[PDB]
């Protein structure tokens, strides 16, 4: 505890995100909406906005 701020211990947690190539399994708390077809609509498919 008597060493300086550059020699003090640090705890490191590294999160690495694997982007969408497989079916998504880690997804956020947003709810779902019933699907509409043959109508001009804004969609959001697993984070793909268009």
């Amino acid at each position: 505890p008597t060493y300086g701020v550059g020699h003090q211990p640090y705890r490191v947690v590294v999160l690495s995100f694997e982007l969408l190539h497989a079916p998504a399994t880690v997804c956020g708390p947003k709810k779902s909406t019933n699907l509409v077809k043959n109508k001009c609509v804004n969609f959001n498919f697993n984070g793909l906005t268009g």
Binding site: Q8, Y10, V13, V14, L15, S16
Partner: peptide
């Protein structure tokens, strides 16, 4: 991804 570091 993200890197999280704090003093311990």
């Amino acid at each position: 991804g993200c890197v999280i570091a704090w003093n311990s």
